Amino acid sequence: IGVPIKVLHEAEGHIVTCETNTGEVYRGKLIEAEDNMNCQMSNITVTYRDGRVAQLEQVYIRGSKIRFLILPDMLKNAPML
Amino acid sequence: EMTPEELQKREEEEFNTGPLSVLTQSVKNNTQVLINCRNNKKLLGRVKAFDRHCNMVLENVKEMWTEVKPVNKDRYISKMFLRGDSVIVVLRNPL
Amino acid sequence: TQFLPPNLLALFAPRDPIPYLPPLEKLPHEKHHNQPYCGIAPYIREFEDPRDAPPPTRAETREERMERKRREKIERRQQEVETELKMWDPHNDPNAQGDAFKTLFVARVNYDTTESKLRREFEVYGPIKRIHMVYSKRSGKPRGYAFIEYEHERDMHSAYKHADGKKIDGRRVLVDVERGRTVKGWRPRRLGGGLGGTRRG
Amino acid sequence: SLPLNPKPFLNGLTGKPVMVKLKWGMEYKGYLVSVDGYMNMQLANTEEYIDGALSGHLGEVLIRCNNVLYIRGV
Amino acid sequence: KLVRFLMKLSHETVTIELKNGTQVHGTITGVDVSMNTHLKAVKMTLKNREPVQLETLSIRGNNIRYFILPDSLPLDTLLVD
Amino acid sequence: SSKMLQHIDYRMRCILQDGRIFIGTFKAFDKHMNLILCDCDEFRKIKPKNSKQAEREEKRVLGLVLLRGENLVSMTVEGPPPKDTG
Amino acid sequence: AHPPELKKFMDKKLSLKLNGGRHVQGILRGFDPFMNLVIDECVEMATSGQQNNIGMVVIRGNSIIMLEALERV
Amino acid sequence: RLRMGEIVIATPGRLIDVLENRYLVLSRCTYVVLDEADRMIDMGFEPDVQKILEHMPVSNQKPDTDEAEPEKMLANFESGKHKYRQTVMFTATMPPAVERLARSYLRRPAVVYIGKPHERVEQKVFLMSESEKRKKLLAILEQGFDPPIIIFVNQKKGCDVLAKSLEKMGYNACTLREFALSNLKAGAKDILVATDVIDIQDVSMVVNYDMAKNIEDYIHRIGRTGRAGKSGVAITFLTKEDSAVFYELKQAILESPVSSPPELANHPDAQHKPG
Amino acid sequence: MVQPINLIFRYLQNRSRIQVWLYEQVNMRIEGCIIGFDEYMNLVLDDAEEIHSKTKSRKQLGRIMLKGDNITLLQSV
RNA sequence: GCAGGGGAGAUACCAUGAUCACGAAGGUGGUUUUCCCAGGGCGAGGCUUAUCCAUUGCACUCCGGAUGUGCUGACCCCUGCGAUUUCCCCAAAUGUGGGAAACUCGACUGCAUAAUUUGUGGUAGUGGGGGACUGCGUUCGCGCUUUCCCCUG
RNA sequence: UUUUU
């Protein structure tokens, strides 16, 4: 497990954002993140490429279609970093 | 699969017998070849070295493309290294 | 951080979300391809047949000269062996006398052992008519080989069958039959032949 | 009939003429020469066809794995 | 393999043209097995963008499309190993 | 990996595949080129379709950003690490 | 090759996004480590407002962008 | 295979993960075989076995009376799909854990006892110091053996060190998945080093350089030489740290007609029962 | 739990006319009887036909081998 | 899961005191040497910017002293590394070292690793703007479409 | 030894 993979695993359980490959951005509580950056979120707020916003009860984003992830700043206080 | 051991001598037989022989003759017979890539250009030149991933080293290559009436343009490079990912097709020069 | 108290979890608070902004690039399936990719069928003007580079212009670095030097040294050694095989004749040598069928050969012997101890060791199998040790022509050191020609071939056969592997002066010596004037096509170790496998690899 | 996997189908297509369509829209019709474990294609006396109509004749042509989309007989 | 020949191109002034039209000309200080090139004092000319000089520039192997070597490069000697 | 370790914790401006540039303190890296940027700011050039004007930069603070290496194109040294000495 | 966490979405009606700007909706009967899914009572959901039923279908994971659970897992 | 779908061979952790994630159902299950239930209790899989049995239908369980132990039992066997569930638990001994598992899962079982590796194999256990017998190992390997052979070790790491030492000694040694067993069965690997944990044929020699802490593990190691046919030779290096099993090994010295030891039988720490 | 591989095997055994859309292309699809499959999701079809959304015509090619990368979503009928 | 701990040539010198009438070549194990050279030690010299002390100076061959951050860096040394345990030997004999191994951790390298989840492309690079030059709708700002010349990547 | 490949 790499150090960004460790940071993504430690970022689960809190509210994080993730930009999709299609242009959408979903921000919500990250339930579980895997080694392949597949992230599950519960009660997330998604924003499409046009700018419209929506709410989702449960969503799952593959790591192959994930562009970037925005974590809280406390993950910068990790003992590895 | 076919070769789980540390002996990978079948790769040379596949490069000498398979499609890569069309590249491997180009290193052997020193014949010219035109390769069309994903960048809408056709590079004509000689094949000096290649690998399993079709990454080639070309010498005295000339890449020709068409910009804009479609005006053709060309550019010569004495030594270039073409990645196998951006290559779409390659065909040896008929002679 | 998952199984954490809320006092510690309050330090793990997310920041403000990013503002809404349009993407810089459009969709790849919805992009406007003004000039897509095409084949090289109009692009076939690479080279003609008579004005072509030659094939064999390729070579290794610093290995071909060493391989040619090794091949030349091997050819010189083979020529020296072929020259030495023509001048080698055990039937015309003064050191090789007597009956070859009744003469045994004792090799791998110690240099400190004299011919008298070898004669006393070889006289147990029968009477020895002649004993000839091998010495160096320039230095004078013994080469560890000797020829014992007996009066009877049965005594030489008993010495070859019984004294093979016997320890002489602390060293086990080998006993065999004479193959220089009895075996057809035999060659010594100096002529690319010989017996033994002590220095095979 | 037996369930024909693409590997014996490509083996039977070798030596026989076949048409391979790429993901970029271009196609190549010619005698299938050789194939490998990554489903690469080799062709001899092949003709390149763009947008359905024949564009020209290239000859011996190597078609890569990621660029080739489909391949069919004749 | 062909990455071993590119790994021996340290401190050589090459020109890496990317798939997005960016061309970076500079002396490659290091190359890896994943075709990533780290160069020093590079001049980058992107598509629809002005060139700029940088003291260090790292390019991934996936984004690199072509590499132009000098004409005096010993391609015969470098392909022996 | 000394060339990547020499630029550790520095203000690196990594260029993405979409043309955006994220400048931030590179906190961690991996074998798949996934980067961790601390206090990252993202900027992008907008083409002026109205008239012949200067290029517009649209920056946005993301904080702790986890960028994938598949979306990363190039990265250069933009600024020094935040020093604790006065 | 870590498998995805689609056990909560097993036999649950969810909506997934396709590669070419399309969407689908149906019961995810299983999953693959390459994110290949099996949809039961699948919906077409094209660019037009009208949709079509396909029933059982197989979706490749290379073309699946994001899946949103309509049954709340 | 789960999508493909008559019987399923599983481990308790993997079957518990499949049943907890709804990957497999037991609505049509009517037969439960528990091979090595004592080894399942020793591995800690007995709460996992209880959680796996909790997913079984209780409406198909047999009543705990005299009818489960034969005319009514054969009539229930002739019911076809309307038959009750059956349980067959195979083990090497009868601990209270496997007895409670047979009392819970099975209803009035019939006991069939065979199955004795200590009585059917020449236990050539070297009562001499295990370290001295460890040196004798090289001597036992130089004395000749029939491939494949088994090298039992208390720990996997030691087992790996013994395999590397046998590889340095000019012998093809396997470490312990299926690729090592196929090499051992085909004749490539001559000695497989492993722990006290299968898929193995009859072996001529079983070398226990590290003695197990229990007699059931020693019986399971001796059973790898073959339940019938060739008896084999089980050479066990005995030390001072295995003395709490040596009295039990005295029982292995007691009930072994195919084996001839005075060092283990007349040992002071093996003369009385431990505890 | 129904798997896509077992579903593709059942569709190949039943010889149902499967229609699969193209990857990153919403115009053309390929319909036909799935004669066989492979480990890399390559499908060999006995009677394949390419159907376009704009022209609304199906051009038949015959026994065609399609790579697994082009496959995006396959349905029945 | 698996294997590993610099390679490629000449060695003329030494050992293997080579089983045939004085020899082998060559290989192997040491020494020396040439390339791919890799990680370090020694930091002379040079660049950059601040603090303190001194200098009112007549030059046209740069150049007052000390310290700090960031760098570059020749000559000279080693063939690998950080940790454990055993035997033998030189020995300034409990220290310093040399020759061997047993093998473990620091995710060091390659591997069915170019076939759907980052390291061999469905992220192509196909533009932007100024003058004349079309048509549709119009809130007269513009959305689409049809041309030539220029500046620019 | 006893999914998490």
mmCIF file of all heavy atoms in Angstrom, chain E residues 18-21 33-34 46-49 62, chain J residues 37 110 119-121 123-127 153, unseen atoms left out:
data_model
loop_
_atom_site.group_PDB
_atom_site.id
_atom_site.type_symbol
_atom_site.label_atom_id
_atom_site.label_comp_id
_atom_site.label_asym_id
_atom_site.label_seq_id
_atom_site.Cartn_x
_atom_site.Cartn_y
_atom_site.Cartn_z
ATOM 1 N N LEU E 18 5.198 15.695 -26.526
ATOM 2 C CA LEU E 18 4.108 15.021 -25.838
ATOM 3 C C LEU E 18 2.933 14.798 -26.781
ATOM 4 O O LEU E 18 2.908 15.284 -27.913
ATOM 5 C CB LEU E 18 3.657 15.830 -24.618
ATOM 6 N N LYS E 19 1.945 14.046 -26.287
ATOM 7 C CA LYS E 19 0.753 13.761 -27.079
ATOM 8 C C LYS E 19 -0.169 14.968 -27.186
ATOM 9 O O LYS E 19 -1.004 15.017 -28.095
ATOM 10 C CB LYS E 19 -0.006 12.578 -26.480
ATOM 11 N N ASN E 20 -0.044 15.937 -26.279
ATOM 12 C CA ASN E 20 -0.851 17.148 -26.306
ATOM 13 C C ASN E 20 -0.170 18.285 -27.060
ATOM 14 O O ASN E 20 -0.597 19.439 -26.950
ATOM 15 C CB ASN E 20 -1.193 17.586 -24.880
ATOM 16 N N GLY E 21 0.883 17.985 -27.822
ATOM 17 C CA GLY E 21 1.581 18.982 -28.603
ATOM 18 C C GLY E 21 2.699 19.707 -27.888
ATOM 19 O O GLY E 21 3.391 20.515 -28.519
ATOM 20 N N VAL E 33 12.438 2.981 -15.821
ATOM 21 C CA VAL E 33 11.908 1.878 -16.614
ATOM 22 C C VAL E 33 10.507 2.178 -17.131
ATOM 23 O O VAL E 33 10.073 1.578 -18.121
ATOM 24 C CB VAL E 33 11.914 0.574 -15.796
ATOM 25 N N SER E 34 9.782 3.091 -16.481
ATOM 26 C CA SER E 34 8.452 3.496 -16.910
ATOM 27 C C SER E 34 8.478 4.675 -17.879
ATOM 28 O O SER E 34 7.468 5.379 -18.004
ATOM 29 C CB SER E 34 7.588 3.838 -15.694
ATOM 30 N N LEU E 46 4.316 24.467 -25.172
ATOM 31 C CA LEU E 46 3.068 23.719 -25.221
ATOM 32 C C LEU E 46 2.220 24.165 -26.408
ATOM 33 O O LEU E 46 2.550 25.111 -27.127
ATOM 34 C CB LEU E 46 2.287 23.898 -23.918
ATOM 35 N N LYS E 47 1.110 23.455 -26.611
ATOM 36 C CA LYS E 47 0.179 23.814 -27.670
ATOM 37 C C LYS E 47 -0.600 25.064 -27.282
ATOM 38 O O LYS E 47 -1.219 25.109 -26.212
ATOM 39 C CB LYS E 47 -0.778 22.655 -27.950
ATOM 40 N N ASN E 48 -0.561 26.067 -28.168
ATOM 41 C CA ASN E 48 -1.173 27.390 -27.977
ATOM 42 C C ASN E 48 -0.674 28.060 -26.696
ATOM 43 O O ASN E 48 -1.436 28.659 -25.935
ATOM 44 C CB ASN E 48 -2.704 27.309 -28.000
ATOM 45 N N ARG E 49 0.633 27.949 -26.464
ATOM 46 C CA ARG E 49 1.264 28.530 -25.289
ATOM 47 C C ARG E 49 2.711 28.873 -25.611
ATOM 48 O O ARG E 49 3.363 28.214 -26.424
ATOM 49 C CB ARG E 49 1.202 27.581 -24.084
ATOM 50 N N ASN E 62 3.726 7.973 -19.908
ATOM 51 C CA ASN E 62 2.468 7.872 -20.638
ATOM 52 C C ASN E 62 2.199 9.119 -21.468
ATOM 53 O O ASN E 62 1.635 9.028 -22.564
ATOM 54 C CB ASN E 62 1.314 7.624 -19.664
ATOM 55 P P C J 37 27.167 4.762 -19.223
ATOM 56 O OP1 C J 37 26.094 5.315 -18.360
ATOM 57 O OP2 C J 37 27.408 5.353 -20.564
ATOM 58 O "O5'" C J 37 28.537 4.814 -18.411
ATOM 59 C "C5'" C J 37 28.566 5.208 -17.045
ATOM 60 C "C4'" C J 37 28.478 4.012 -16.130
ATOM 61 O "O4'" C J 37 29.669 3.193 -16.262
ATOM 62 C "C3'" C J 37 28.398 4.303 -14.643
ATOM 63 O "O3'" C J 37 27.093 4.669 -14.235
ATOM 64 C "C2'" C J 37 28.884 2.998 -14.024
ATOM 65 O "O2'" C J 37 27.844 2.033 -14.006
ATOM 66 C "C1'" C J 37 29.943 2.548 -15.035
ATOM 67 N N1 C J 37 31.326 2.878 -14.609
ATOM 68 C C2 C J 37 31.990 1.991 -13.753
ATOM 69 O O2 C J 37 31.413 0.960 -13.371
ATOM 70 N N3 C J 37 33.253 2.275 -13.356
ATOM 71 C C4 C J 37 33.853 3.386 -13.778
ATOM 72 N N4 C J 37 35.099 3.623 -13.359
ATOM 73 C C5 C J 37 33.207 4.308 -14.650
ATOM 74 C C6 C J 37 31.960 4.013 -15.037
ATOM 75 P P G J 110 12.542 -3.321 -12.452
ATOM 76 O OP1 G J 110 12.518 -2.365 -13.589
ATOM 77 O OP2 G J 110 11.538 -3.197 -11.367
ATOM 78 O "O5'" G J 110 12.440 -4.796 -13.050
ATOM 79 C "C5'" G J 110 13.110 -5.143 -14.255
ATOM 80 C "C4'" G J 110 13.131 -6.636 -14.470
ATOM 81 O "O4'" G J 110 13.729 -7.288 -13.319
ATOM 82 C "C3'" G J 110 11.777 -7.315 -14.615
ATOM 83 O "O3'" G J 110 11.243 -7.213 -15.925
ATOM 84 C "C2'" G J 110 12.082 -8.750 -14.203
ATOM 85 O "O2'" G J 110 12.694 -9.459 -15.270
ATOM 86 C "C1'" G J 110 13.119 -8.543 -13.106
ATOM 87 N N9 G J 110 12.532 -8.564 -11.750
ATOM 88 C C8 G J 110 12.235 -7.470 -10.975
ATOM 89 N N7 G J 110 11.745 -7.783 -9.808
ATOM 90 C C5 G J 110 11.718 -9.167 -9.810
ATOM 91 C C6 G J 110 11.278 -10.069 -8.810
ATOM 92 O O6 G J 110 10.821 -9.815 -7.691
ATOM 93 N N1 G J 110 11.419 -11.393 -9.210
ATOM 94 C C2 G J 110 11.918 -11.801 -10.423
ATOM 95 N N2 G J 110 11.970 -13.127 -10.614
ATOM 96 N N3 G J 110 12.330 -10.968 -11.369
ATOM 97 C C4 G J 110 12.201 -9.672 -11.000
ATOM 98 P P G J 119 -0.847 3.815 -17.007
ATOM 99 O OP1 G J 119 -0.748 5.020 -17.867
ATOM 100 O OP2 G J 119 -1.671 2.663 -17.451
ATOM 101 O "O5'" G J 119 0.630 3.286 -16.734
ATOM 102 C "C5'" G J 119 1.756 3.984 -17.248
ATOM 103 C "C4'" G J 119 3.037 3.215 -17.029
ATOM 104 O "O4'" G J 119 3.464 3.341 -15.652
ATOM 105 C "C3'" G J 119 2.970 1.713 -17.257
ATOM 106 O "O3'" G J 119 3.034 1.362 -18.630
ATOM 107 C "C2'" G J 119 4.146 1.191 -16.434
ATOM 108 O "O2'" G J 119 5.357 1.287 -17.170
ATOM 109 C "C1'" G J 119 4.202 2.199 -15.276
ATOM 110 N N9 G J 119 3.704 1.671 -13.985
ATOM 111 C C8 G J 119 4.464 1.673 -12.838
ATOM 112 N N7 G J 119 3.861 1.172 -11.801
ATOM 113 C C5 G J 119 2.614 0.808 -12.279
ATOM 114 C C6 G J 119 1.527 0.209 -11.592
ATOM 115 O O6 G J 119 1.457 -0.126 -10.404
ATOM 116 N N1 G J 119 0.439 -0.001 -12.431
ATOM 117 C C2 G J 119 0.405 0.329 -13.762
ATOM 118 N N2 G J 119 -0.738 0.047 -14.408
ATOM 119 N N3 G J 119 1.411 0.890 -14.411
ATOM 120 C C4 G J 119 2.491 1.106 -13.626
ATOM 121 P P U J 120 2.537 -0.087 -19.119
ATOM 122 O OP1 U J 120 1.333 -0.453 -18.328
ATOM 123 O OP2 U J 120 3.712 -0.993 -19.131
ATOM 124 O "O5'" U J 120 2.082 0.146 -20.627
ATOM 125 C "C5'" U J 120 0.920 0.915 -20.934
ATOM 126 C "C4'" U J 120 0.869 1.324 -22.389
ATOM 127 O "O4'" U J 120 2.117 1.976 -22.749
ATOM 128 C "C3'" U J 120 0.670 0.189 -23.396
ATOM 129 O "O3'" U J 120 -0.143 0.649 -24.478
ATOM 130 C "C2'" U J 120 2.088 -0.071 -23.900
ATOM 131 O "O2'" U J 120 2.155 -0.641 -25.190
ATOM 132 C "C1'" U J 120 2.693 1.329 -23.868
ATOM 133 N N1 U J 120 4.153 1.346 -23.701
ATOM 134 C C2 U J 120 4.918 1.831 -24.742
ATOM 135 O O2 U J 120 4.434 2.237 -25.784
ATOM 136 N N3 U J 120 6.273 1.822 -24.521
ATOM 137 C C4 U J 120 6.925 1.386 -23.385
ATOM 138 O O4 U J 120 8.155 1.440 -23.334
ATOM 139 C C5 U J 120 6.062 0.900 -22.352
ATOM 140 C C6 U J 120 4.739 0.896 -22.540
ATOM 141 P P G J 121 -1.702 0.261 -24.540
ATOM 142 O OP1 G J 121 -2.337 0.689 -23.268
ATOM 143 O OP2 G J 121 -1.806 -1.155 -24.972
ATOM 144 O "O5'" G J 121 -2.282 1.174 -25.710
ATOM 145 C "C5'" G J 121 -1.853 2.519 -25.865
ATOM 146 C "C4'" G J 121 -2.840 3.490 -25.268
ATOM 147 O "O4'" G J 121 -2.189 4.766 -25.039
ATOM 148 C "C3'" G J 121 -4.048 3.841 -26.125
ATOM 149 O "O3'" G J 121 -5.075 2.865 -26.071
ATOM 150 C "C2'" G J 121 -4.465 5.195 -25.568
ATOM 151 O "O2'" G J 121 -5.186 5.037 -24.356
ATOM 152 C "C1'" G J 121 -3.109 5.819 -25.244
ATOM 153 N N9 G J 121 -2.617 6.669 -26.344
ATOM 154 C C8 G J 121 -1.641 6.368 -27.262
ATOM 155 N N7 G J 121 -1.432 7.331 -28.119
ATOM 156 C C5 G J 121 -2.325 8.325 -27.747
ATOM 157 C C6 G J 121 -2.562 9.608 -28.304
ATOM 158 O O6 G J 121 -2.012 10.144 -29.274
ATOM 159 N N1 G J 121 -3.560 10.290 -27.611
ATOM 160 C C2 G J 121 -4.239 9.799 -26.522
ATOM 161 N N2 G J 121 -5.168 10.603 -25.988
ATOM 162 N N3 G J 121 -4.027 8.607 -25.996
ATOM 163 C C4 G J 121 -3.064 7.930 -26.652
ATOM 164 P P U J 123 -8.003 7.413 -23.321
ATOM 165 O OP1 U J 123 -6.684 6.793 -23.604
ATOM 166 O OP2 U J 123 -8.754 7.013 -22.104
ATOM 167 O "O5'" U J 123 -7.800 8.991 -23.279
ATOM 168 C "C5'" U J 123 -8.870 9.857 -22.927
ATOM 169 C "C4'" U J 123 -8.436 11.302 -22.934
ATOM 170 O "O4'" U J 123 -7.345 11.492 -21.997
ATOM 171 C "C3'" U J 123 -7.884 11.822 -24.251
ATOM 172 O "O3'" U J 123 -8.895 12.183 -25.176
ATOM 173 C "C2'" U J 123 -7.017 12.996 -23.813
ATOM 174 O "O2'" U J 123 -7.815 14.144 -23.563
ATOM 175 C "C1'" U J 123 -6.465 12.489 -22.475
ATOM 176 N N1 U J 123 -5.100 11.920 -22.596
ATOM 177 C C2 U J 123 -4.027 12.799 -22.617
ATOM 178 O O2 U J 123 -4.147 14.010 -22.545
ATOM 179 N N3 U J 123 -2.792 12.209 -22.725
ATOM 180 C C4 U J 123 -2.516 10.861 -22.813
ATOM 181 O O4 U J 123 -1.346 10.486 -22.906
ATOM 182 C C5 U J 123 -3.670 10.016 -22.782
ATOM 183 C C6 U J 123 -4.885 10.561 -22.672
ATOM 184 P P A J 124 -8.978 11.466 -26.613
ATOM 185 O OP1 A J 124 -10.015 12.162 -27.415
ATOM 186 O OP2 A J 124 -9.089 10.002 -26.386
ATOM 187 O "O5'" A J 124 -7.559 11.755 -27.280
ATOM 188 C "C5'" A J 124 -7.183 13.068 -27.673
ATOM 189 C "C4'" A J 124 -5.786 13.093 -28.240
ATOM 190 O "O4'" A J 124 -5.747 12.327 -29.473
ATOM 191 C "C3'" A J 124 -5.248 14.461 -28.634
ATOM 192 O "O3'" A J 124 -4.730 15.187 -27.534
ATOM 193 C "C2'" A J 124 -4.201 14.116 -29.682
ATOM 194 O "O2'" A J 124 -3.007 13.655 -29.068
ATOM 195 C "C1'" A J 124 -4.864 12.936 -30.391
ATOM 196 N N9 A J 124 -5.649 13.366 -31.564
ATOM 197 C C8 A J 124 -7.014 13.354 -31.697
ATOM 198 N N7 A J 124 -7.440 13.793 -32.855
ATOM 199 C C5 A J 124 -6.273 14.117 -33.531
ATOM 200 C C6 A J 124 -6.034 14.637 -34.815
ATOM 201 N N6 A J 124 -7.004 14.936 -35.680
ATOM 202 N N1 A J 124 -4.749 14.845 -35.187
ATOM 203 C C2 A J 124 -3.768 14.548 -34.323
ATOM 204 N N3 A J 124 -3.870 14.054 -33.090
ATOM 205 C C4 A J 124 -5.160 13.859 -32.750
ATOM 206 P P G J 125 -4.982 16.768 -27.417
ATOM 207 O OP1 G J 125 -4.713 17.176 -26.015
ATOM 208 O OP2 G J 125 -6.303 17.065 -28.026
ATOM 209 O "O5'" G J 125 -3.858 17.414 -28.345
ATOM 210 C "C5'" G J 125 -3.592 18.813 -28.299
ATOM 211 C "C4'" G J 125 -3.125 19.368 -29.628
ATOM 212 O "O4'" G J 125 -1.832 18.801 -29.974
ATOM 213 C "C3'" G J 125 -4.045 19.112 -30.824
ATOM 214 O "O3'" G J 125 -4.045 20.262 -31.671
ATOM 215 C "C2'" G J 125 -3.354 17.954 -31.545
ATOM 216 O "O2'" G J 125 -3.634 17.868 -32.924
ATOM 217 C "C1'" G J 125 -1.884 18.263 -31.281
ATOM 218 N N9 G J 125 -1.002 17.092 -31.333
ATOM 219 C C8 G J 125 -1.349 15.780 -31.127
ATOM 220 N N7 G J 125 -0.341 14.958 -31.236
ATOM 221 C C5 G J 125 0.741 15.776 -31.533
ATOM 222 C C6 G J 125 2.104 15.454 -31.766
ATOM 223 O O6 G J 125 2.649 14.344 -31.755
ATOM 224 N N1 G J 125 2.859 16.589 -32.033
ATOM 225 C C2 G J 125 2.371 17.873 -32.072
ATOM 226 N N2 G J 125 3.262 18.836 -32.348
ATOM 227 N N3 G J 125 1.103 18.186 -31.861
ATOM 228 C C4 G J 125 0.349 17.096 -31.595
ATOM 229 P P U J 126 -5.217 21.356 -31.551
ATOM 230 O OP1 U J 126 -4.597 22.705 -31.508
ATOM 231 O OP2 U J 126 -6.128 20.931 -30.459
ATOM 232 O "O5'" U J 126 -6.011 21.234 -32.925
ATOM 233 C "C5'" U J 126 -5.387 21.541 -34.163
ATOM 234 C "C4'" U J 126 -5.981 20.734 -35.290
ATOM 235 O "O4'" U J 126 -6.195 19.372 -34.839
ATOM 236 C "C3'" U J 126 -7.352 21.183 -35.780
ATOM 237 O "O3'" U J 126 -7.279 22.253 -36.706
ATOM 238 C "C2'" U J 126 -7.935 19.904 -36.368
ATOM 239 O "O2'" U J 126 -7.425 19.675 -37.673
ATOM 240 C "C1'" U J 126 -7.361 18.840 -35.431
ATOM 241 N N1 U J 126 -8.309 18.438 -34.359
ATOM 242 C C2 U J 126 -9.247 17.469 -34.660
ATOM 243 O O2 U J 126 -9.335 16.940 -35.756
ATOM 244 N N3 U J 126 -10.089 17.136 -33.627
ATOM 245 C C4 U J 126 -10.095 17.654 -32.349
ATOM 246 O O4 U J 126 -10.923 17.249 -31.531
ATOM 247 C C5 U J 126 -9.097 18.646 -32.110
ATOM 248 C C6 U J 126 -8.262 18.986 -33.094
ATOM 249 P P G J 127 -8.310 23.482 -36.615
ATOM 250 O OP1 G J 127 -9.661 22.986 -36.987
ATOM 251 O OP2 G J 127 -7.718 24.624 -37.358
ATOM 252 O "O5'" G J 127 -8.333 23.861 -35.069
ATOM 253 C "C5'" G J 127 -9.053 24.998 -34.612
ATOM 254 C "C4'" G J 127 -8.608 25.425 -33.236
ATOM 255 O "O4'" G J 127 -7.175 25.234 -33.104
ATOM 256 C "C3'" G J 127 -8.826 26.893 -32.900
ATOM 257 O "O3'" G J 127 -10.145 27.167 -32.457
ATOM 258 C "C2'" G J 127 -7.764 27.158 -31.842
ATOM 259 O "O2'" G J 127 -8.183 26.670 -30.576
ATOM 260 C "C1'" G J 127 -6.616 26.280 -32.342
ATOM 261 N N9 G J 127 -5.675 27.023 -33.205
ATOM 262 C C8 G J 127 -5.451 26.767 -34.536
ATOM 263 N N7 G J 127 -4.567 27.559 -35.073
ATOM 264 C C5 G J 127 -4.178 28.389 -34.031
ATOM 265 C C6 G J 127 -3.239 29.451 -34.018
ATOM 266 O O6 G J 127 -2.549 29.879 -34.950
ATOM 267 N N1 G J 127 -3.143 30.033 -32.759
ATOM 268 C C2 G J 127 -3.857 29.648 -31.653
ATOM 269 N N2 G J 127 -3.623 30.335 -30.527
ATOM 270 N N3 G J 127 -4.735 28.656 -31.653
ATOM 271 C C4 G J 127 -4.848 28.071 -32.866
ATOM 272 P P G J 153 4.916 32.105 -31.952
ATOM 273 O OP1 G J 153 6.157 32.577 -31.289
ATOM 274 O OP2 G J 153 4.886 31.941 -33.426
ATOM 275 O "O5'" G J 153 4.501 30.713 -31.297
ATOM 276 C "C5'" G J 153 4.341 30.590 -29.892
ATOM 277 C "C4'" G J 153 3.408 29.461 -29.536
ATOM 278 O "O4'" G J 153 2.091 29.715 -30.088
ATOM 279 C "C3'" G J 153 3.778 28.092 -30.083
ATOM 280 O "O3'" G J 153 4.774 27.439 -29.314
ATOM 281 C "C2'" G J 153 2.440 27.365 -30.089
ATOM 282 O "O2'" G J 153 2.106 26.918 -28.784
ATOM 283 C "C1'" G J 153 1.485 28.498 -30.469
ATOM 284 N N9 G J 153 1.217 28.537 -31.918
ATOM 285 C C8 G J 153 1.782 29.381 -32.843
ATOM 286 N N7 G J 153 1.341 29.175 -34.054
ATOM 287 C C5 G J 153 0.433 28.137 -33.916
ATOM 288 C C6 G J 153 -0.365 27.482 -34.890
ATOM 289 O O6 G J 153 -0.423 27.701 -36.106
ATOM 290 N N1 G J 153 -1.147 26.481 -34.320
ATOM 291 C C2 G J 153 -1.161 26.152 -32.986
ATOM 292 N N2 G J 153 -1.985 25.157 -32.628
ATOM 293 N N3 G J 153 -0.424 26.757 -32.070
ATOM 294 C C4 G J 153 0.344 27.732 -32.604
#
